[PDB]
Amino acid sequence: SRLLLNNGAKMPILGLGTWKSPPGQVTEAVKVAIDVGYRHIDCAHVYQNENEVGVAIQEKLREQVVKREELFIVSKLWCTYHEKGLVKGACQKTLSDLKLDYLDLYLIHWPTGFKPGKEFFPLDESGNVVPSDTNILDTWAAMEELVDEGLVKAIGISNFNHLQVEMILNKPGLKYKPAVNQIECHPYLTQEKLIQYCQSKGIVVTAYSPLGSPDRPYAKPEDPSLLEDPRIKAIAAKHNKTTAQVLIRFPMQRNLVVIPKSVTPERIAENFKVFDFELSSQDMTTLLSYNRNWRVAALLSCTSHKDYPFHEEF
Numbered sequence: 300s301r302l303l304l305n306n307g308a309k310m311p312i313l314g315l316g317t318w319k320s321p322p323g324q325v326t327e328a329v330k331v332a333i334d335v336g337y338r339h340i341d342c343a344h345v346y347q348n349e350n351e352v353g354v355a356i357q358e359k360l361r362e363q364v365v366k367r368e369e370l371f372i373v374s375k376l377w378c379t380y381h382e383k384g385l386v387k388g389a390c391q392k393t394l395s396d397l398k399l400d401y402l403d404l405y406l407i408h409w410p411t412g413f414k415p416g417k418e419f420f421p422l423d424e425s426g427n428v429v430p431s432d433t434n435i436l437d438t439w440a441a442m443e444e445l446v447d448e449g450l451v452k453a454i455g456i457s458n459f460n461h462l463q464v465e466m467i468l469n470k471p472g473l474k475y476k477p478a479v480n481q482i483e484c485h486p487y488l489t490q491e492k493l494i495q496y497c498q499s500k501g502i503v504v505t506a507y508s509p510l511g512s513p514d515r516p517y518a519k520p521e522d523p524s525l526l527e528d529p530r531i532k533a534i535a536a537k538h539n540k541t542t543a544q545v546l547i548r549f550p551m552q553r554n555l556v557v558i559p560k561s562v563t564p565e566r567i568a569e570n571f572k573v574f575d576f577e578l579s580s581q582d583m584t585t586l587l588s589y590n591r592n593w594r595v596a597a598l599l600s601c602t603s604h605k606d607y608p609f610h611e612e613f
């Protein structure tokens with residue numbers, strides 16, 4: 300139920316995602332998830348709903364349904380705050396909204412720095428994203444300070460390719476290794492090489508969009524759908540489980556942390572019931588064979604950023 304991180308802490312293998320969870324619904328969603336047994340919530344300042352996630356955590360802490368030490372709360376530094384001097388302030392904003400005094404894990408959300416400002420996606424006159432001249436290593440140094448200051452227990456990365464990971468690992472005077480690399484992973488984007496790399500380095504991998512993000516912004520024509528894949532539905536039927544339950548279990552048996560999103564009480568409940576069954580190695584190998592290198596999150600607007608992560612094979 301929990302994986303051991305390189306800082307000695309233990310991360311729940313199941314977490315609740317909150318991207319696209321509306322402010323008006325996410326408080327009840329998180330209260331329900333905690334009641335059901337979730338102990339890990341995935342957040343980000345860019346999701347514009349951390350205050351409302353925080354209301355729910357505060358209510359369950361007050362009710363004594365959980366202790367603070369039993370929860371594992373994750374957030375992420377957005378791209379407009381990569382400058383050394385903006386990092387602490389961005390973390391503290393998130394702490395204020397979540398109404399906590401430390402985060403369990405704080406991730407660099409994307410490797411690409413953008414120009415600082417109010418816009419999450421700063422554009423120039425020709426409509427292009429304006430990049431920061433910051434690099435990944437100076438940002439890492441700023442994240443390490445947060446650990447020394449007691450604001451976060453662990454720090455990590457998200458959407459980093461193996462060369463960008465290696466860059467941090469070979470950083471002169473590296474004080475804290477990345478604990479976690481959070482990446483997109485599901486049967487259409489299986490990530491076998493990047494997962495084996497990170498895992499050989501003792502970095503825990505968290506799979507996001509495990510159900511294929513059916514509620515993502517654009518349903519772009521003849522779009523692949525994991526929940527509706529007849530081959531995956533067969534494997535669920537054989538196990539008497541739903542295709543969502545098979546999609547959540549799959550990464551767990553690869554020793555990945557998985558963070559399905561839902562604001563629906565019965566689905567939040569359904570997605571928890573994945574600890575009592577096992578997919579065979581045959582099932583696993585079959586699910587791995589469906590890889591089509593399909594990404595939900597390709598960050599196409601940043602394809603010419605100096606630190607765009609997806610030009611490299613893995």
Ligand SMILES: NC(=O)c1ccc[n+]([C@@H]2O[C@H](COP(=O)([O-])OP(=O)(O)OC[C@H]3O[C@@H](n4cnc5c(N)ncnc54)[C@H](OP(=O)(O)O)[C@@H]3O)[C@@H](O)[C@H]2O)c1
Pocket residue numbers: 315316317318319341342408457458481482506507508509510511512513514526541543544558559560561562563566567569570596
């Ligand atoms: N680091 C990054 O760059 C990054 C990027 C993307 C995502 N993430 C994290 O990963 C989380 C999960 O990814 P995601 O939100 O893209 O999508 P996801 O979990 O793959 O899919 C969420 C969608 O599936 C529906 N759903 C949930 N359980 C279901 C079930 N049992 N049966 C049928 N449908 C089900 C949800 O609907 P309802 O909500 O209506 O129930 C929602 O529409 C995010 O919320 C976020 O926390 C991180």
Ligand SMILES: O=C(O)CN1C(=O)c2cccc3cccc(c23)C1=O
Pocket residue numbers: 420595596597598599600
């Ligand atoms: O281009 C794509 O494939 C999809 N995509 C976007 O279109 C995008 C636009 C706006 C904000 C973002 C923040 C995180 C991730 C993405 C974006 C992303 O992957």
Ligand SMILES: O=C(O)CN1C(=O)c2cccc3cccc(c23)C1=O
Pocket residue numbers: 318343345515516595596597
């Ligand atoms: O970055 C994240 O964590 C979440 N995220 C995506 O992964 C994403 C992928 C596809 C299209 C998008 C359009 C707007 C915003 C986002 C996206 C966004 O915030």
